[PDB]
Amino acid sequence: ERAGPVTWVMMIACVVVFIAMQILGDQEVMLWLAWPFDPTLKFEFWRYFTHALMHFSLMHILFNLLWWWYLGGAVEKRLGSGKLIVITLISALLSGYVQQKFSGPWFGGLSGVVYALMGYVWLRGERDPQSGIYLQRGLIIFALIWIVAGWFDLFGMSMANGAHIAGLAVGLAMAFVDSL
Ligand SMILES: CCCCCCCCCO[C@@H]1O[C@H](CO)[C@@H](O)[C@H](O)[C@H]1O
Ligand SMILES: CCCCCCCCCO[C@@H]1O[C@H](CO)[C@@H](O)[C@H](O)[C@H]1O
Ligand SMILES: CCCCCCCCCO[C@@H]1O[C@H](CO)[C@@H](O)[C@H](O)[C@H]1O
């Protein structure tokens, strides 16, 4: 059993962008993929989503992709590619929106999406056991440690706590709906 298409394409896209960032520098890549940072860019629609493809350190991309691989992979396998796509698009948009509102357009990474997937997988398994999806008891602990690491700034994750709560809200909301 291997990761499905959406899980895989996202991971490779993040690695490619990360490489581009090491070669050209973070600033040059953000210039092209960051949330619109000037009126002149408000209609370059890819920017409302591409911010999620940029990571600023090895630990940042390492842990984001591990969680995405595990959670996103599980969602895609058991619920389908369509499900992962919607959770991803919505959480990326909302967390990106909240982040820029309070901290500006210079940010990036899948942490908002990971918070969404954590909330979704955990809640879906708690309310809808026979759905087949759930967050392994032991992994809940390390998810909490990862959450705490970002919350108290012990680990730089680009995005602020408010943005992460927005991503989490999306996952919980969708899990609630799916267990309805
Ligand atoms: C503490 C860091 C977070 C935990 C990371 C756990 C990663 C587990 C990855 O498992 C892999 O997932 C794929 C998609 O679900 C499966 O196709 C594959 O067979 C399986 O080997
Ligand atoms: C986005 C991931 C967030 C994970 C937060 C989940 C909170 C779980 C911590 O509480 C524990 O929950 C278990 C299952 O609900 C109970 O068996 C246990 O008694 C309780 O101590
Ligand atoms: C520094 C972070 C290192 C974390 C290492 C965690 C190893 C244990 C994770 O096991 C994974 O658990 C999943 C859910 O049970 C399985 O689906 C998957 O196949 C399995 O590989």
Side-chain angles (χ1 to χ4, degrees), residues 2-129 131-180:
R2 60 170 157 186
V6 176
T7 299
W8 168 243
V9 178
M10 173 64 80
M11 288 171 82
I12 195 167
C14 289
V15 169
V16 168
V17 172
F18 188 72
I19 289 171
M21 292 174 73
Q22 309 314 303
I23 298 178
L24 313 165
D26 292 354
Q27 302 96 316
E28 265 308 306
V29 173
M30 291 198 278
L31 216 57
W32 284 78
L33 306 180
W35 183 280
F37 52 88
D38 191 291
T40 159
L41 312 172
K42 53 190 168 185
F43 298 138
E44 302 192 330
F45 295 93
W46 68 84
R47 295 177 181 279
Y48 294 102
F49 308 83
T50 58
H51 50 82
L53 304 179
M54 300 184 285
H55 297 86
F56 310 86
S57 73
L58 284 175
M59 292 298 95
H60 188 196
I61 189 166
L62 174 62
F63 285 95
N64 274 184
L65 292 193
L66 275 170
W67 284 121
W68 163 272
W69 179 32
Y70 171 58
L71 303 166
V75 168
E76 177 164 41
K77 174 189 178 180
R78 312 222 164 196
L79 312 180
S81 297
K83 180 83 63 177
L84 182 54
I85 289 167
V86 181
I87 296 175
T88 302
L89 295 176
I90 300 183
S91 62
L93 279 166
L94 192 60
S95 65
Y97 175 71
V98 172
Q99 181 61 31
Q100 72 78 33
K101 167 67 174 174
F102 299 101
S103 314
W106 308 109
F107 65 89
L110 281 176
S111 65
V113 177
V114 170
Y115 267 81
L117 292 167
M118 286 184 166
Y120 184 84
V121 174
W122 173 73
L123 187 54
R124 186 68 186 283
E126 202 71 357
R127 306 179 73 81
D128 197 342
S131 69
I133 229 166
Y134 66 90
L135 186 49
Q136 186 74 19
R137 217 186 214 187
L139 260 12
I140 288 178
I141 295 302
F142 300 95
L144 286 174
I145 290 181
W146 180 82
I147 289 174
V148 170
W151 200 274
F152 298 89
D153 304 327
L154 301 172
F155 171 23
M157 240 176 251
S158 183
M159 303 202 93
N161 302 338
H164 287 154
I165 284 177
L168 178 69
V170 173
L172 294 176
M174 286 184 78
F176 174 71
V177 158
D178 286 353
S179 69
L180 217 49

